[PDB]
Design an enzyme around this catalytic site. Structure first.
Site, PDB file in Angstrom:
ATOM      1  N   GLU A 178       0.930  -1.123  -0.114  1.00 51.43           N
ATOM      2  CA  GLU A 178      -0.048  -0.037  -0.129  1.00 51.43           C
ATOM      3  C   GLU A 178       0.917   1.217  -0.007  1.00 51.43           C
ATOM      4  O   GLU A 178       1.953   1.220   0.594  1.00 51.43           O
ATOM      5  CB  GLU A 178      -0.763  -0.055   1.118  1.00 51.43           C
ATOM      6  CG  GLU A 178      -1.209   1.222   1.884  1.00 51.43           C
ATOM      7  CD  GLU A 178      -1.326   1.502   3.349  1.00 51.43           C
ATOM      8  OE1 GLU A 178      -0.683   0.362   3.796  1.00 51.43           O
ATOM      9  OE2 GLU A 178      -2.043   2.411   3.867  1.00 51.43           O
ATOM     10  N   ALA A 211      -2.648  -5.920   2.840  1.00 52.85           N
ATOM     11  CA  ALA A 211      -2.968  -7.389   3.108  1.00 52.85           C
ATOM     12  C   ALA A 211      -3.783  -7.523   4.251  1.00 52.85           C
ATOM     13  O   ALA A 211      -4.454  -8.616   4.811  1.00 52.85           O
ATOM     14  CB  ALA A 211      -1.860  -8.229   3.672  1.00 52.85           C
ATOM     15  N   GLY A 240       0.176  -8.065   7.837  1.00 48.52           N
ATOM     16  CA  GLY A 240       0.147  -9.022   6.714  1.00 48.52           C
ATOM     17  C   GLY A 240       1.177  -8.995   5.987  1.00 48.52           C
ATOM     18  O   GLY A 240       1.489 -10.229   5.528  1.00 48.52           O
ATOM     19  N   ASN A 279       7.753  -4.435  20.934  1.00 46.43           N
ATOM     20  CA  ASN A 279       7.385  -2.836  21.057  1.00 46.43           C
ATOM     21  C   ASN A 279       7.219  -2.512  22.792  1.00 46.43           C
ATOM     22  O   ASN A 279       7.501  -1.626  22.866  1.00 46.43           O
ATOM     23  CB  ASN A 279       6.203  -2.752  20.026  1.00 46.43           C
ATOM     24  CG  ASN A 279       6.404  -2.254  18.787  1.00 46.43           C
ATOM     25  OD1 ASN A 279       7.684  -1.785  18.509  1.00 46.43           O
ATOM     26  ND2 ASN A 279       5.388  -2.207  17.974  1.00 46.43           N
ATOM     27  N   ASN A 333      10.579   4.661  16.714  1.00 43.08           N
ATOM     28  CA  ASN A 333      11.608   4.410  15.491  1.00 43.08           C
ATOM     29  C   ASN A 333      13.212   4.995  15.913  1.00 43.08           C
ATOM     30  O   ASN A 333      14.047   4.290  15.515  1.00 43.08           O
ATOM     31  CB  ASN A 333      11.163   4.656  14.339  1.00 43.08           C
ATOM     32  CG  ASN A 333       9.756   3.733  13.750  1.00 43.08           C
ATOM     33  OD1 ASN A 333       9.853   2.737  14.373  1.00 43.08           O
ATOM     34  ND2 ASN A 333       9.328   4.344  12.798  1.00 43.08           N
ATOM     35  N   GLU A 382      30.284 -13.242  10.380  1.00 45.75           N
ATOM     36  CA  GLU A 382      30.696 -13.130  11.532  1.00 45.75           C
ATOM     37  C   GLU A 382      29.681 -13.029  12.613  1.00 45.75           C
ATOM     38  O   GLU A 382      30.001 -13.515  13.663  1.00 45.75           O
ATOM     39  CB  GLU A 382      31.757 -12.047  11.777  1.00 45.75           C
ATOM     40  CG  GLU A 382      32.669 -11.958  12.880  1.00 45.75           C
ATOM     41  CD  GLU A 382      33.928 -11.465  12.505  1.00 45.75           C
ATOM     42  OE1 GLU A 382      34.006 -10.865  11.532  1.00 45.75           O
ATOM     43  OE2 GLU A 382      34.877 -11.319  13.291  1.00 45.75           O
TER      44      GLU A 382
HETATM   45  N1  LIG Z   1       8.161  -0.387  16.422  1.00 46.41           N
HETATM   46  C1  LIG Z   1       7.464   0.133  15.545  1.00 46.41           C
HETATM   47  N2  LIG Z   1       6.312  -0.783  15.269  1.00 46.41           N
HETATM   48  C2  LIG Z   1       5.650  -0.669  14.315  1.00 46.41           C
HETATM   49  C3  LIG Z   1       5.560   0.472  13.303  1.00 46.41           C
HETATM   50  N3  LIG Z   1       4.665   0.472  12.525  1.00 46.41           N
HETATM   51  C4  LIG Z   1       3.882  -0.780  12.647  1.00 46.41           C
HETATM   52  N4  LIG Z   1       4.358  -1.277  13.829  1.00 46.41           N
HETATM   53  C5  LIG Z   1       3.827  -2.663  14.298  1.00 46.41           C
HETATM   54  O1  LIG Z   1       3.607  -3.546  13.399  1.00 46.41           O
HETATM   55  C6  LIG Z   1       2.647  -4.353  13.531  1.00 46.41           C
HETATM   56  C7  LIG Z   1       1.432  -4.112  12.451  1.00 46.41           C
HETATM   57  O2  LIG Z   1       2.236  -4.424  11.210  1.00 46.41           O
HETATM   58  P1  LIG Z   1       2.201  -3.547  10.112  1.00 46.41           P
HETATM   59  O3  LIG Z   1       3.807  -3.131   9.865  1.00 46.41           O
HETATM   60  O4  LIG Z   1       1.654  -2.248  10.220  1.00 46.41           O
HETATM   61  O5  LIG Z   1       1.685  -4.305   8.980  1.00 46.41           O
HETATM   62  P2  LIG Z   1       2.089  -4.218   7.275  1.00 46.41           P
HETATM   63  O6  LIG Z   1       3.635  -4.517   7.341  1.00 46.41           O
HETATM   64  O7  LIG Z   1       1.775  -2.798   7.089  1.00 46.41           O
HETATM   65  O8  LIG Z   1       1.239  -5.057   6.438  1.00 46.41           O
HETATM   66  P3  LIG Z   1      -0.299  -4.827   6.212  1.00 46.41           P
HETATM   67  O9  LIG Z   1      -1.134  -5.888   7.138  1.00 46.41           O
HETATM   68  O10 LIG Z   1      -0.645  -5.410   4.768  1.00 46.41           O
HETATM   69  O11 LIG Z   1      -0.814  -3.431   6.452  1.00 46.41           O
HETATM   70  C8  LIG Z   1       1.719  -3.662  14.745  1.00 46.41           C
HETATM   71  O12 LIG Z   1       1.985  -4.446  16.151  1.00 46.41           O
HETATM   72  C9  LIG Z   1       2.493  -2.309  15.122  1.00 46.41           C
HETATM   73  O13 LIG Z   1       2.868  -2.148  16.530  1.00 46.41           O
HETATM   74  C10 LIG Z   1       6.613   1.290  13.372  1.00 46.41           C
HETATM   75  O14 LIG Z   1       6.788   2.154  12.642  1.00 46.41           O
HETATM   76  N5  LIG Z   1       7.479   1.113  14.790  1.00 46.41           N
HETATM   77 MG   LIG Z   2      -0.212  -1.486   6.072  1.00 44.79          MG
END
Ligand SMILES: Nc1nc2c(ncn2[C@@H]2O[C@H](COP(=O)(O)OP(=O)(O)OP(=O)(O)O)[C@@H](O)[C@H]2O)c(=O)[nH]1
Ligand SMILES: [Mg+2]
Ligand SMILES: Nc1ncnc2c1ncn2[C@@H]1O[C@H](COP(=O)(O)OP(=O)(O)CP(=O)(O)O)[C@@H](O)[C@H]1O
Ligand SMILES: Nc1nc2c(ncn2[C@@H]2O[C@H](COP(=O)(O)OP(=O)(O)O)[C@@H](O)[C@H]2O)c(=O)[nH]1
Ligand SMILES: CN(C)C(=O)c1ccc(F)cc1Br
Ligand SMILES: [Ca+2]
Ligand SMILES: [Ca+2]
Ligand SMILES: [Ca+2]
Ligand SMILES: [Mg+2]
Ligand SMILES: [Mg+2]
EC number: 3.6.5.-
Lengths: 438, 54, 425, 347
Positions: free
Chosen positions: A71, A99, A144, A206, A228, A254
């Site tokens: 996306e 997803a 996803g 997290n 982040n 390594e």
């Molecule tokens: N530390 C940290 N965690 C994140 C961040 N963005 C999302 N998350 C964590 O990632 C999890 C959800 O995964 P996403 O990365 O949003 O999912 P995606 O890879 O975009 O895949 P989709 O389901 O298609 O949206 C949640 O538990 C969030 O807490 C981020 O910028 N930093």
């Molecule tokens: Mg997403």
């Protein structure tokens, strides 16, 4: 000089990648426009920072990175952000609909129709490498895309780049910053199909980054930006050896040698200190012994657990700042007499130590304060299995009622791949207990 | 308490300390997994349309 | 660019939908002519989710108005924002449905359905990427019930992998037009079980009791009931209309709220609900005690009679997000006997900075609760009380239906009640 | 409105605590598998510590210190004492002990024989006891008895000169209950018990184990004088204190209590850096039952430490209520003359 290609998958992977490359640039003296005044070899050179940056005749330093999201909303931040000029459009790959937090959807349904494209863009970055080391993969467990598409990309990278190593920076799901209920499923699905394909994985929970922000930085409700900028500090410390002159962790090979004696147990725990609020009046600077002694506190671990009731298999100490070996050894002695550090009887009770004299760089206007010295400890403890236990337990609670299972079968996945995946974790947990408990 | 393999350069130095001594799926098989699930989505949608025709 | 296609059918469908566009159009700074006059870029960020951008910076809703008589839709076209809707998107007949599900689904409605899908297809073809559809309608009438479900059955055929969302108004003898409303509702509910991903149940009796008891309205009117639905519809859609990553997609929302394909009927709730002591500021604790209170729920179901499968909360306004989490965690930890323990963290909270019109802050409740079985139990009881005597059946058999199809709708919904029952234990 | 769960139906102590918590109207019990809990009364074996402290907005507390089995296991205790410098091998309040693995499976077999052959040579008393029970003065019988089993055992010196109450000439032991809260304060219950033997002590016949073992179940099963001298073979500190003053001209505090308070400290302080929950994501607290022996020189020896002990019937009410004051309410305050004795120390 050997190159390292970074791959950022999903929102979490992409945003975190955006905060690391922001940090890499400030460290190596690279400006937003890609120019580097300190690089005297214009459009060429095999320096230690060239493992992460390629160069153009015009003098631009281009990250060896590839961003992939199903996306466009998150990657569009990169195309118009501060460091838009760093990357060219080929490196940024976006889809049209995501997803929906469904591993099956990112792996099978959507993944199949975009997998060949990613590989082709990655093959282009590989075609610039004179001796590609491997890949660094940043992604989440719950998403996803980060879960479903990553496991598929990992399977394919083991086919096109067999002898190359592959490291993970994975994000453990924490309810305090997530609105998805099926993240256990995804986490346990991806860890199953990815296991035999990753040589070393750094899990960041997290929940740990969250409490470290609230406790140390006095942030009442931290944002992803806060999380982040801290996560990229740990990443910077772990990748420093690859980007700077040095003799410890000089290439991705390594990492497996020094940290993973048993293959399936490739999840080292990371510990970092100090994390001091920038808004503080002015902090008393900690010594070598005090920050080292902090590496054995549950409070600054990337995954909350109790190492005292586990057994170490390996241990590294990456120091950045005003540090010398004389001080490092001194603290270690004192700690052994106080702490509980039980090693496995088939591994030596030693510590590999690297030191980089440049202290940790901080993002102007960020949340962290400038310290004179800091350490990051990578220890392979059987205590990290606690994470798998919690996660596995949640999985069992839902799967017992087949909750949400239909969303995965509806995208073509077989219900059997659930238990087959869960049995693999049951085996992963047993391997930890066979190595830790008596 | 021994210190071995001390390497020093301009940007830092690394060493080791010993306290105590000790005591895949091919390309053909992935395209089949993908095409197998795609076939179960087609069969599930066909049965959906068959239901809608009835 | 994740576009939604709105569809409103029938008397109830259109009046409620009409007010819905009246409510959100105000929040997005859109005037009755389509021109934008807001003051915050947040108003336009996700504007293309429910609106199409025409020439001259005009914003035209992505809505399709459907009815078998011209009366109700003529009122919309002459109502407040009536001029804003696309003229071609008015698809209507003259026969009327006579409050008969059979006429709306098999005879009258069938003659008009092909031309409504011609407009839906025209809206989708322009979408860069379509999330799915959402339909406002009632279930006790003939058009929005009989023909509405006909549209859903046919929409899912032409777009089988898109989300189908509906705001359904359930009939209640206390707010009754005709005595055949149980017949109509029992027949639609089977369609929604099969062909919808999410259905916000809205019991007219709950809306009535809320206006009479809580809002202190001596004599409530349909208009009063519609005000609530507007505020509620504006609420559940906040996730989709503003910059919020909590429950962005309809599919993501469905994936986190529906653990089982058939149990996708939600109880919505709204707070505050104050009578004209209206200027008082409402603290975060108060918002949360009301939001979960049954008297603020619009399904007329007692959640303490069942269990929560999943729960989504949305808080709107400039407030302490730390205080939001604290109070949400307090509600769960003080009543953890009503949340199934076999779904970890089944309560998610989203925050939004823009409050609704005229409120310093508010909250919207969305609950997949097994207590919703109490709703389908009332309907099935009123259905059987008549179908046993074959009362009023000729209105339907005269349209081509058989007593068999009625017996199946009966058994199909008694199965839905049993399904909600095994998961409440 | 605090919440707790129960995962050990067999615990007679916390069963009372659960009853008192509900009698406060401020605590609510949940199912034994609901993770949204403030307090857990966990299972004895394989308590899932790894799953504690991960529920947002909840401050969780548990009633077992993780890793305390090092102190509440026969072989573990011995290993801990001989290896921890805080206790040293030359510890004077713990009987000379050795860990002995059966030959069908480190092991101190040969180390035990050396110290054994030294005693038989010096004409000293050479009577040992094995447990994990057999008492014998011949090394051949002790070892042969361990091989017939299949679990780890411990052979330690048998106190041939135990203190004998009069009238009766009978053996006994002392049970002290120690409570440790989340701040690692060591509270000692003011009330102990002496599970006495109703049989006269006989040192010329270790075959009949009725006068040598003071367990409450063996005295109430294999003894013919149960309940003769004191009710249920349990003399409490008041009576036992009056007896010490009438016969020996000294107090229970000076003669025995000082040594007990010192042993409890040295044991708990020793492992504090290993089980402390001072910076953990959850909090711990545990109730302990120390079993002491007293010889005819009024010297206190440590027998074993129970991690899941029971209480004397008369003292259930007073102690359980005290567990709620210092351990639970100090963390979840509700809306004296402490019945404990704080043992200050350096953390
Ligand atoms: N530390 C940290 N965690 C994140 C961040 N963005 C999302 N998350 C964590 O990632 C999890 C959800 O995964 P996403 O990365 O949003 O999912 P995606 O890879 O975009 O895949 P989709 O389901 O298609 O949206 C949640 O538990 C969030 O807490 C981020 O910028 N930093
Ligand atoms: Mg997403
Ligand atoms: N070295 C020793 N000298 C004298 N008596 C001893 C002894 N070792 C054990 N005993 C006797 O054994 C009894 C305690 O046995 P032990 O505690 O080892 O078994 P156990 O743990 O099953 C009973 P409990 O746990 O209830 O105290 C005491 O009554 C004590 O008199
Ligand atoms: N909330 C609400 N319910 C309505 C309204 N108008 C009708 N209804 C309900 O809808 C049912 C009648 O359906 P109706 O819309 O007249 O059927 P139609 O022929 O498809 O338009 C009855 O149970 C009414 O209580 C309205 O404006 N608001
Ligand atoms: C015929 N009928 C149902 C009404 O006029 C009506 C409408 C709304 C309401 F809240 C109560 C009533 Br009564
Ligand atoms: Ca160069
Ligand atoms: Ca490989
Ligand atoms: Ca006609
Ligand atoms: Mg009508
Ligand atoms: Mg015992």
């Amino acid at each position: 000089m050997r190159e390292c290609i970074s791959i950022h998958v999903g929102q979490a992977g992409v945003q975190i990648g955006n905060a690391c490359w922001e940090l890499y640039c400030l460290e190596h003296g690279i400006q937003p426009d890609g120019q580097m005044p300190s690089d005297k070899t214009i459009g060429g050179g095999d320096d230690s920072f060239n493992t992460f940056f390629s160069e153009t005749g015009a003098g631009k330093h281009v990250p060896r990175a590839v961003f992939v999201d199903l996306e466009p909303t998150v990657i569009d931040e990169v195309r118009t952000g501060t460091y838009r000029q760093l990357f060219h459009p080929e490196q940024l790959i976006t889809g049209k609909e995501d997803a929906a937090n469904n591993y099956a959807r990112g792996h099978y349904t959507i993944g199949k129709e975009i997998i060949d494209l990613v590989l082709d863009r990655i093959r282009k970055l590989a075609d610039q490498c004179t001796g590609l080391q491997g890949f660094l993969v940043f992604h989440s467990f719950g998403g996803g895309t980060g879960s479903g598409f990553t496991s598929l990309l990992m399977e394919r990278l083991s086919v096109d780049y067999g002898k190359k190593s592959k490291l993970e920076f994975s994000i453990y799901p924490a309810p305090q910053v997530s609105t998805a209920v099926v993240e256990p499923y995804n986490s346990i699905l991806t860890t199953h199909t990815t296991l035999e394909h990753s040589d070393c994985a750094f899990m960041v929970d997290n929940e740990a980054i969250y409490d470290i922000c609230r406790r140390n930085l006095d942030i009442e409700r931290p944002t992803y930006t806060n999380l982040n900028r801290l996560i990229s500090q740990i990443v910077s410390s772990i990748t420093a050896s690859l980007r700077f002159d040095g003799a410890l962790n000089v290439d991705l090979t390594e990492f497996q040698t020094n940290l993973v004696p048993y293959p399936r147990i490739h999840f080292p725990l990371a510990t970092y200190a100090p994390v001091i609020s920038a808004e503080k009046a002015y902090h008393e600077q900690l010594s070598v012994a005090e920050i080292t002694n902090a590496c054995f506190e549950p409070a600054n671990q990337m995954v909350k657990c109790d190492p005292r009731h586990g057994k170490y298999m390996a241990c590294c100490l990456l120091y950045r700042g005003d540090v010398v070996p004389k001080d490092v050894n001194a603290a270690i002695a004192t700690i052994k007499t106080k702490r509980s550090i039980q090693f496995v009887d088939w591994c030596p009770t030693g510590f590999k130590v690297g030191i980089n004299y440049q202290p940790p760089t901080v993002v102007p206007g960020g949340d962290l304060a400038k310290v004179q010295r800091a350490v990051c400890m990578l220890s392979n403890t059987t205590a990290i299995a606690e994470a798998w236990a919690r996660l596995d337990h949640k999985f069992d609670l839902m799967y017992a009622k087949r909750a949400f299972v239909h969303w995965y079968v509806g995208e073509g996945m077989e219900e059997g791949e659930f238990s087959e995946a869960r049995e693999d974790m049951a085996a992963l947990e047993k391997d930890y207990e066979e190595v830790g408990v008596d | 308490m021994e210190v071995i393999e001390l390497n020093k350069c301009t940007s830092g130095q690394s060493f080791e300390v010993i306290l105590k001594p000790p005591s895949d799926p091919s390309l053909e098989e992935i395209q089949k997994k993908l095409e197998a699930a795609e076939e179960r989505r087609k069969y599930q949608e066909a049965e959906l349309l068959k239901h809608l025709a009835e | 660019m994740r576009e939604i296609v709105h569809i409103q059918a029938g008397q109830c469908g259109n009046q409620i939908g009409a007010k819905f566009w009246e409510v959100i159009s105000d929040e997005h700074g859109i005037d009755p002519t389509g021109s934008y006059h807001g003051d915050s870029d947040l108003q336009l960020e996700r504007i293309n989710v429910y609106y199409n951008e025409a020439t001259g910076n005009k914003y035209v809703p992505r809505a399709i108005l459907v009815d078998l008589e011209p009366g109700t839709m003529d009122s919309v076209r002459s109502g407040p924002f009536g001029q804003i809707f696309r003229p071609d998107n008015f698809v209507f007949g003259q026969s009327g449905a006579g409050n008969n599900w059979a006429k709306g689904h098999y005879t009258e409605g069938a003659e008009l359905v092909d031309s409504v899908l011609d407009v839906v297809r025209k809206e989708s073809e322009s979408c860069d990427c379509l999330q799915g559809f959402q339909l406002t309608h009632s279930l006790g009438g003939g058009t929005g019930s009989g023909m509405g479900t006909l549209l859903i059955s046919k929409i899912r055929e032409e777009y089988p992998d898109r989300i189908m969302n509906t705001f359904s108004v359930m009939p209640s003898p206390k707010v009754s037009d005709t005595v055949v409303e149980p017949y109509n509702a029992t027949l639609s509910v089977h369609q929604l079980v099969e062909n919808t991903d999410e259905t916000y149940c809205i019991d007219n009796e709950a809306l009535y009791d809320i206006c009479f008891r809580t809002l202190k309205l001596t004599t409530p009117t349909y208009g009063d009931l519609n005000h609530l639905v507007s505020a509620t519809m504006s609420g559940v859609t906040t996730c989709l209309r503003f910059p919020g990553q909590l429950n962005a997609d309809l599919r993501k929302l469905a994936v986190n709220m529906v653990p089982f394909p058939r149990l996708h009927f939600f109880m919505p709730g709204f707070a505050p609900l104050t009578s004209r002591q209206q200027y008082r500021a409402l603290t975060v604790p108060e918002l949360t005690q009301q939001m979960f209170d049954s008297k603020n729920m619009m399904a007329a179901c007692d959640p303490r009679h069942g269990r929560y499968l999943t729960v989504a909360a949305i808080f709107r306004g400039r407030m302490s997000m730390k205080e939001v989490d604290e109070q949400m965690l307090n509600v769960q930890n003080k009543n953890s006997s009503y949340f199934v323990e076999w779904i970890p963290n089944n309560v998610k909270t989203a925050v939004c900075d823009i409050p609704p019109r005229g409120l310093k802050m508010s909250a919207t409740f969305i609950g997949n609760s097994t207590a919703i079985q109490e709703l389908f139990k009332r309907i099935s009881e009123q259905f059987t009380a008549m179908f046993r005597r074959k009362a009023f059946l000729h209105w339907y058999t005269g349209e081509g239906m058989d007593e068999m199809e009625f017996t199946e709708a009966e058994s199909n919904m008694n199965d839905l009640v049993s399904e909600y029952q095994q998961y409440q234990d | 409105m605090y919440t707790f769960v129960v995962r050990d139906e067999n615990s007679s102590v916390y069963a009372e605590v659960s009853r008192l918590l509900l009698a406060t109207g401020q605590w609510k019990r949940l199912r034994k598998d609901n993770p949204r809990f403030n307090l857990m009364l966990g299972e004895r074996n394989r308590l899932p510590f790894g799953r504690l402290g991960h529920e947002p907005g909840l401050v969780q507390l548990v009633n077992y210190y993780r890793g305390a089995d090092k102190l509440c296991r026969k072989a573990s205790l011995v290993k801990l004492i001989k290896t921890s410098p805080e206790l040293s091998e030359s510890c004077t309040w713990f009987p000379e002990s050795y860990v002995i693995y059966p030959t069908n499976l480190t092991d101190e077999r040969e180390v035990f024989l050396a110290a054994y052959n030294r005693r038989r040579e010096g004409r000293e008393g050479n009577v040992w006891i094995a447990k994990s029970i057999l008492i014998s003065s011949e090394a051949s019988e002790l070892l042969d008895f361990i091989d017939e089993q299949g679990q780890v055992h411990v052979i330690q010196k048998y106190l041939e000169k135990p203190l004998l109450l009069e009238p009766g000439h009978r053996k006994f032991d002392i049970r002290s209950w120690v409570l440790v809260d989340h701040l690692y304060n060591i509270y000692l219950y003011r009330e102990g018990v002496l599970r006495t033997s109703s049989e006269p002590y006989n040192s010329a016949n270790f075959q009949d184990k009725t006068c040598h073992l003071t367990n409450h179940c063996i005295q109430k099963e294999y003894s013919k004088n149960y309940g003769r001298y004191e009710e249920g073979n349990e003399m409490f500190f008041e009576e036992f204190n009056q007896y010490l003053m009438d016969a020996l001209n000294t107090t229970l505090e000076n003669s025995i209590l000082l040594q007990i308070k010192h042993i409890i400290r040295s044991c708990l302080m020793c492992i504090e850096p290993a089980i402390s929950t001072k910076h953990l994501h959850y909090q711990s607290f545990q109730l302990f039952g120390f079993d002491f022996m007293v010889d005819e020189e009024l010297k206190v020896w440590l027998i074993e430490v129970n991690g899941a002990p029971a209480c004397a019937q008369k003292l259930y009410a007073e102690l359980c209520q005290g567990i709620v004051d210092v351990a639970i309410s100090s963390v979840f305050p509700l809306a004296p003359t402490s019945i404990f004795i704080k043992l200050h120390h350096h953390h």
